[PDB]
Amino acid sequence: AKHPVPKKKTSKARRDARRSHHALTPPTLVPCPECKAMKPPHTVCPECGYYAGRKVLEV
Amino acid sequence: PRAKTGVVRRRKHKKILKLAKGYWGLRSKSFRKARETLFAAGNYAYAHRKRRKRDFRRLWIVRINAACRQHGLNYSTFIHGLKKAGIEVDRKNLADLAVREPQVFAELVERAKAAQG
Amino acid sequence: MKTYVPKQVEPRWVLIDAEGKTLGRLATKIATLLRGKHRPDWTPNVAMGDFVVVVNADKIRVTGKKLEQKIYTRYSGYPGGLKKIPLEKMLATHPERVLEHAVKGMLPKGPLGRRLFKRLKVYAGPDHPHQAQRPEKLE
Amino acid sequence: MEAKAIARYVRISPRKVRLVVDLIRGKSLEEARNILRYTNKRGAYFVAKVLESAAANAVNNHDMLEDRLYVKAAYVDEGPALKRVLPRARGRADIIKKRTSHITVILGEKHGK
Amino acid sequence: MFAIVKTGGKQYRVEPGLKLRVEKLDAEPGATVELPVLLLGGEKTVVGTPVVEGASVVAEVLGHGRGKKILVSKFKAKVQYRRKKGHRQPYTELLIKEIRG
RNA sequence: GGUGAAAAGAACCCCGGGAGGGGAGUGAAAUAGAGCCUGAAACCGUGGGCUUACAAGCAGUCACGGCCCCGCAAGGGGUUGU
RNA sequence: UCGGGGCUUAAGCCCAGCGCCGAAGCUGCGGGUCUGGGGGAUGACCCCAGGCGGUAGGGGAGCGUUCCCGAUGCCGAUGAAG
After folding, report:
1. What is the helix (H) or strand (E) element at residue E57, kind and residue range?
2. Contact D9, D113 (CB under 8 A)
3. A7/chain B closest Cα distance in angstroms
4. Taking the C1' atom of F77, which residue's CA lies nearest?
5. Spatial CB neighbours of B72, under 8 Å, sequence gap ≥ 6
């Protein structure tokens, strides 16, 4: 509305290049020791958990 | 009477549009832009008819001269060698039976030298 | 029509000598494969520039009086116009810019220093730890 | 075959879920499931749900088994939109939109022999 | 074995038995083309001060033809001048016979 | 302003919380499927065929080349490095 | 920074020399064009001399579009217009 107003119209090229710099990046998961589940790193999987065993209510 | 303006417009439109297809830019994705750039392209085409001819003149002259260098003399001498003697033609390009066939080349060189030395 | 396609005519490994001589005729033919003058148009690197590598090794003398400053420049071939490599301050700039003005005088800069850099140095001092063609079109 | 399954006229703007599609596009079932299951997103378990849609048709309507079902495409467009008028200071009335998607999750063949 | 010829303001190096065109000809559609000109051969065959006239080159012709239309679409950059045209160069096709020189 | 000739307007079942789809039947026709004749372009997308990271730009054109696919031949598409 | 590089028995100047290069301007070949003349009874067509820089503006001409005639018709399921 004030001053920095689009001089001209940008190109689809530079548009989806500006877009190109952000390719959606995946998360991280390792297995649980004594089960079948891809828990996030260091984190205890919702069920199972860690050593000593606790919670276990994520049916 | 109403002449329902229908597809005439869109047809010549996509005529020029169809002519465009092969470029970069919104010119290759706009009607009014394609058009203009195509105009420019046509200008280029004519220019490059006549200039195709002239740049060809250039290359002919060039490698004929360079071969002439690789042997003994140079271009101007070469030319008066042909021109004076009697050989009023050659089609400069046709002399490109030179590196393609260095034999007849060398001999004709000796012609130019002979009747103009 | 007509056809003068030579494909890859294969490398001409000449290395002419006239290093004691001229300062401009120190090109033209030495040009034809070089420039203080000759071939530009966004392609002819320091490369063929080398070759000759003024394998005659280095400097020598001067025609006029503009001494105490140079080792030499502009017009070689490839992109930024014509191309080179400037002077004596660039005796420094990697390896030294002598009557190889022409070649290792063009050259030592890091950027045509892209143009592979890669064809020269006091290498060009006729050891050039290599092999060429010793008729070298001496003339 | 190439199991075709879809859920049209639903939420999320193009950019986001189009990147969600080309996030796991070309990687088998197992991975897909666990990934969509675990991503700081909305289209994560969303496009996971339409993945469930795609899962039934290929297992219990195409029958190719879940172990052979790999991620075959997903193209996911823009659809229509939602055109709202935003109130904004100094008498300004603006036009702002909500864009949408055409999630075409396909799954398909394993080895091929 | 070659041979040179100045045909229709176009000069060539013609071989003994191939090739496909010249300038538009006032010559018979599908019969006998005797070229009363000549300007070379193979193993040494100089052209004289005029033409080569020890004899002549011989061609066969296989019909007439037109080749790739060019739309002369030259416009002007402002106050109107949009010439939309297109010329298609008319010519005659051939295929030689020999070069009896 | 438009499904069909008429609703015969999709029953039974599978993913879902539904919304939407997936098999069905139906009718000549289901990109005639419920806002349903056509459905351009602008504008937004998927795979793959071709190029682009030494480069100075009214981005087009001319000569050549490299590639992919039509062509029996010659040819040709088009990709665009010099 | 003379376009730039770079040039000193010049690549600067003076004088002479022959040679080439090099414009859509000219030659040849090929096409258009209008015109003038003649054959053209001939329409046609052919030959012949010449101009075509072109804005306003003069003038000839040429494509397409809704609908009336042509129609109590012709094409159209083997498939109309878009």
Report:
1. strand E57-59
2. no
3. 17
4. B22
5. B109
B7 lies within 8 A of chain C by CB: no
Both tokens of residue E72? 């002369």
The two tokens of residue A27 are: 């998360």
Residue A56: partners with Cβ closer than 8 Å, 6 or more residues away? A47, A48, A49
Looking at the structure of chain D, the number of domains it has is 1
CATH code for position D62: 3.90.470.10
Q: Are C106 and C84 in contact (CB under 8 A)?
A: yes
Beta bridge partners of C104: C106
CB A36 within 8 A of CB A47: no
Strand G nucleotides within 7 Å of a protein CB: 4-9, 11, 18-24, 27-31, 54-56, 64-67, 82
As a whole number of angstroms, the distance between CA C125 and CA C137 comes to 17
C113 token code pair: 């220093």
Alpha-helical (H) ranges within chain B are 8-20, 31-71, 75-85, 102-114
| CA atoms of A25 and B109, how far apart (whole Å) | 71
Resolution value in angstroms: 3.8
Q: CA distances (Å), B59 to each of A52, B52, B76, C4, E97, in order?
A: 86, 11, 15, 10, 31
Which tokens hold the place of A57? 């209510």
Termini Cα distance of chain B: 86
**How many residues are recorded in chain E?**
101
**What does each C-alpha distance from C129 to B51, C29, C34, C134, D11 come to in angstroms?**
47, 25, 22, 14, 70
Contacts of D7 (CB under 8 A, 6+ apart): D49, D50, D53, D103
Q: Residues of B from 76 to 95 whose C-beta is within 7 A of strand F: which are they?
A: none
CB contact under 8 A, E73 and B94: no
Domain that holds residue D49: 2-110
List, as ranges, residues 28-57 from A with C-beta within 8 Å of D: 29, 38, 40
D41: CB within 7 A of chain F nucleic strand: no
Q: Are E14 and E21 in contact (CB under 8 A)?
A: no
DSSP string, E3-44: --EEETTEEE---SS---EEE--SS-TTS-EEES-----SSS
> Which residue of E48, E71, E74 is in closest CB contact with B43?
E74
Method used to solve the structure: X-ray
Contact pairs from chain A to chain D, CB under 8 Å? 22
| Ramachandran area for residue E15 (φ above 0: left; ψ -120 to 50: alpha; else beta) | beta
